[PDB]
Design a protein around this ligand. Structure first.
Ligand SMILES: [Cl-]
Ligand SMILES: [Cl-]
Ligand SMILES: [Cl-]
Ligand SMILES: [Cl-]
Lengths: 132, 135, 135, 132
């Protein structure tokens, strides 16, 4: 699960505006903060899916709120985190047959059992993670 | 049916280390003697299972407690025998079906084709990296 | 699909606690903001899954961030929305097949006999007590 | 998995003798220390299986080496631990259908995955443990 920090600003007349520190160029908005979060999620997912559909490598780096919160350009922002999982990206994953040593599977099984994760989800995230 | 002798010894306060004479590379321990034995059994079982799964033969003759009990490197040791049954162990890694996002499978398959790796060996290694980083 | 607002606040040094306004009894935390959210997501999913499995109706209307964002107890909070899909949740506990030595299954059945307990509720409770030995 | 401490004594004009602190009455022996350990394991297993077959409750109280080693009656002993688990007792376990809440199963699954244990083994040991 990836967590994108998003910076929410609001004034008296204008609506909620949102910027995405890890994706300059994305600017979203909402009549309420909940709508702004949801609209920013859609903009982030559409961005990532679009670059994939274009044939581009996409490198999944997320900043943390901790590291951005004291920066002046984010003074007075309301911080939120939008959760993006890889299932949220590809609608038609491919089922493949692979062999994994049992001592590795036992470590995967112990780990995913406490997190509502699967062998498949763990391996897909591990595959992506090793590629960076 | 292999019988691995193991030797538990006191190292510091409330930490018991274990020697496995027939697998010198295994270094298990426990906060209690019983924990140390249970942890060593798990290391030995995983070792034997994993080498058999590589297609190796692991049938050698274990040491006896008798030939080791009087050696001075085992003074004060607490002994146990770990019994390992090889009859049910598979000689190849476990085959599983998994679901992978296509764009991820693409950059796997393109990656392994160049170093002549396998998807399996790639995902196995990738899994171990992800497990170790989480700490 | 249920959208639970969660509020992450920095409680002490290097520890972030989380409030779930619609489940006041859940008190999750994490070493980082991201870990706090992931731990909170897991407690919320487990909560909703477990109550539906008890045969309860859990569909109610979640709070919004909007109605909470300006309240003093949430000053400085970092917000997130945890999305819970109820579609796949089963309304009964998981049925499993297990192998039990007869002499223990005798001393289970004889014991649940006049407590008006079930084998299931007994094994569930015994499992949890046994797990409560966390090192 | 149960671990019975056993005390091994050896004098030259004789063989290895063994006593079992948690089972007074058991006295075993062997030409070698390995034979004496194996013979003591059989006597312990036979003892427990025999009481069960007599219809007696059996309560698994194992001492630890740590708490026995300094007692004067065990001065100069060589200590070993005899491992007994419940499968080593009943030859014909019964297969039953039960319902377990998933949050309990997930905790069982995480625990047993690192130990070569099963849901069934864990629940049988738990059934015996919280049953006192
Ligand atoms: Cl997953
Ligand atoms: Cl899977
Ligand atoms: Cl087991
Ligand atoms: Cl099982």
């Amino acid at each position: 699960m990836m967590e994108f920090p998003i910076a929410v600003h609001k004034d008296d007349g204008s609506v909620y505006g949102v910027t995405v520190p890890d994706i300059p160029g994305v600017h979203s908005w909402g009549e309420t903060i909940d709508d702004a979060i949801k609209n920013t999620r859609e903009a982030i997912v559409g961005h990532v899916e679009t670059l994939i559909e274009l044939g581009e490598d996409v490198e999944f780096t997320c900043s943390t709120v901790e590291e951005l919160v004291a920066k002046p350009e984010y003074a007075g922002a309301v911080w939120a985190l939008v959760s993006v999982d890889l299932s949220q990206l590809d609608s038609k994953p491919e089922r493949i047959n692979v062999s994994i040593p049992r001592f590795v599977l036992h470590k995967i099984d112990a780990y995913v059992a406490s997190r509502h994760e699967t062998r498949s989800g763990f391996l897909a995230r591990a595959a992506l993670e090793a590629l960076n």
